[PDB]
Amino acid sequence: RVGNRYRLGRKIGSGSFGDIYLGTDIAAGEEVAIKLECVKTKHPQLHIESKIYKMMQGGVGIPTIRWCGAEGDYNVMVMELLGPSLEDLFNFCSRKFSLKTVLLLADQMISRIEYIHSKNFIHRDVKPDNFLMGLGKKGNLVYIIDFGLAKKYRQHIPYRENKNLTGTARYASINTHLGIEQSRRDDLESLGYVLMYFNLGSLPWQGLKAATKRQKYERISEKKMSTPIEVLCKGYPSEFATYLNFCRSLRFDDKPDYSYLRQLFRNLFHRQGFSYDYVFDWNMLK
Ligand SMILES: Cc1ccc2nc(NC(=O)CSc3nc4c(c(=O)n3-c3ccccc3)SCC4)sc2c1
User: What GO molecular function terms would the record report?
Assistant: First the structure.
């Protein structure tokens, strides 16, 4: 009923500019994730996003793209099925992750973003929902998904201001709130807020009161810019504050020192005496 060998199932979620459905590859006897886009939509993107996935193929933690085409009223992208998102797993774990789990995640997540940047793209929506654990033998592997908002940043793109927020406000960089064109530094700053989100259970600019929706962004921006990093990270290892400070110090077109940032957390990991066995909090449920 789709691509001759795929059967469409129930709806399991939504991404940028489309919904994700469960499917079965009948010939291979394997489940897949299927993203649908109305063929007649005013701004078609799916075939663009699929070209990005096809170009990222072979990178660690990039989902495999099995088929792309058009059936009936829909453009179709068939992907390997992945496991739960870090947001789902965070909620399943009662919104508290151990330091070991945060550091295991940080190590992989920095690498995913570096890989995307190595392919001349910035993700621009770094958030727990867009990182998924693999299934089965890949269950220790963090995947990144959803390139619907991705953009090619290179010869670097020029410095531009006054550009509406393209991403989630909660994890957006301060530069993004100021209207500055996003670049590599902003993906990493967003990751920094995600890590503090995992440590705290919430960020201090969550749950602010506002009506007309522009007011909400104003208030998030204000709180984010008036919350010093040392206050945000108080009571947690200094490496997280150093990480955020480093990202906030990056120039627009700087190539981030990914190795330095990973080594920050690796050194903390070793000082804690943790083992790199990939045993996350959720793997210890009986
Ligand atoms: C672009 C892309 C690529 C891969 C991919 N993999 C995904 N995996 C999941 O979302 C988790 S599996 C799952 N999620 C949900 C329900 C669900 O029933 N499943 C599921 C699917 C198959 C077998 C068992 C459970 S109910 C609503 C949320 S998103 C996704 C999106």
Answer: ATP binding; cadherin binding; protein kinase activity; protein serine kinase activity; protein serine/threonine kinase activity; tau-protein kinase activity
